[PDB]
Each structure stands twice: as C-alpha cells, then as structure tokens.
Amino acid sequence: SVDANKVKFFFGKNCTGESFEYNKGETVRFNNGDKWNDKFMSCLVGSNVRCNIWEHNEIDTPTPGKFQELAQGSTNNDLTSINGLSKFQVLPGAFQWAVDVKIVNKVNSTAGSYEMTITPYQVDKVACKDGDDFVQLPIPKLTPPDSEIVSHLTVRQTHTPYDYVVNGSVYFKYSPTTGQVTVIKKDETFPKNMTVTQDDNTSFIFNLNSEK
C-alpha cells in the first residue's frame, strides 16, 4: 500500500520492475542524460500528498509543454501520454506549489560562506547556504492564483564577520495554466548586487556578483 502521508514510484506498468520511496515536501529534477529518469512508468500517491509531473519546461515558447498534476490521492498505472518524465515535485497537502532557489558564488571561491534567507507572504523563513540541492519555498494557491506574492530576501554570511550581503525584496508569481513559475523584479523592491535567472521551470538560481 501507499502511505496517506508519503508517495512511492514504480519502474514498470502495473506497479512492477523496480520500487522507490519519497517523502512529502520534496522536489527532484532529473536530466534527460540519466536513463533512470525515463525508467519512470508507474507511481502511487497517498491522499494528503500532491504529486506534480512535468516533461517540458520553457519561458517564451507558445506551445504548452507536457504537464500533469497527479491527483492528491490515486494510483498511476498507465501514463505514457504524460511523455515519460523529467521533473517531479511532491507537496505535503499544504502548499499548492513550491519553488526551488539556490545561491551561486559570482565573487567568492569556496561559496559555502553565504546564506540566503527568504520570507514570502507570512511563510516559514527558510535559510539555505551554498551547499544544498536548491531549497524549496512553500507557496499557497493564493487568491487569485495569478496574483503576485511579496517576499523579503536577506543574504548574510554563515560565519564571521557575519555581515549583510543583500537586504531587499522580490516578487514571485505562477501562471495557473501549466504550473509555470515566474519572478517579478523591479527597482521598487529588487536589489542591485544579486540577480536571479530562471535556470528551469520552478527552478531559480541567484548569482552574487557583489560583496556588501
């Protein structure tokens, strides 16, 4: 059986082949280079845990890439029409979507001396350093879902001299059409020292060229 509170993956039609287990509130982005990604064939989802399966991800193309929200509880026995796999996101039945963010040393050499702490609209602050697999921020359905979300961003050193590197705000938003995630950045809130580029759908990468 599948847990109501966890999810599990099956590497053959009719829950066969190989078997895999997954925690709630986890995001895993495989590459087309690993055949172990295309090994996806079945899966099983509890009842209090969302699952999100994406194959194509783009941010200018007019053709909507293959996307499917796996129902918060069900079995997935034949889903070849989903186009195999490339990205999976598991949500703890509490967030409608989530977003991966990571820092990148564009000034330092070790990298593991900086920490980014971001706090969207009354969300649990999450502190990540240059030594993680893109920290996941929990985002509700909002109202409306195409509405923007205020987020304070504070980048500070993990250790001495413990100085502040960035102390500004950023706007996040998703398009409730194909799970398209986007970031709005304007001189009204956005700082002038760190920038963020959309390395993939739901996957952002912040580059730190300054050293405040």
UniProtKB/Swiss-Prot annotation:
Biological processes per GO annotation: aggregation involved in sorocarp development; biological process involved in interaction with symbiont; calcium-dependent cell-cell adhesion via plasma membrane cell adhesion molecules; defense response to Gram-negative bacterium; heterophilic cell-cell adhesion via plasma membrane cell adhesion molecules; regulation of gene expression; response to curcumin; sorocarp development
Sequence repeats: 1-47, 48-96, 97-145, 146-193
Role, per record: Mediates calcium-dependent cell-cell adhesion during the early stage of development.
GO cellular component: cell cortex; cell periphery; cell-cell junction; contractile vacuole; cytoplasm; endocytic vesicle; external side of plasma membrane; extracellular matrix
Molecular-function GO terms, alphabetical: calcium ion binding; calmodulin binding; identical protein binding
Region (4 X approximate tandem repeats): 1-193
Entry protein name: Calcium-dependent cell adhesion molecule 1
Keyword Membrane assigned: yes
Keywords linked to the UniProt accession: Calcium, Cell adhesion, Cell membrane, Membrane, Repeat
Entry-linked Pfam families: Crystall_3 (PF08964), Membrane_bind (PF14564)
InterPro entries, sorted: Ca_cell_adhesion_N_dom, CAD_C_sf, Dictyostelium_CAD, G_crystallin-like, Membrane-bd
Protein location: Cell membrane
Posttranslational modification: The N-terminus is blocked.
Induction of synthesis: Expression is controlled by rpkA.
Swiss-Prot/TrEMBL domain comment: Cell binding activity is dependent on the N-terminal segment whereas the C-terminal domain tethers the protein to the cell membrane.
Keyword set includes Signal: no
Family classification: Belongs to the Dictyostelium CAD family.
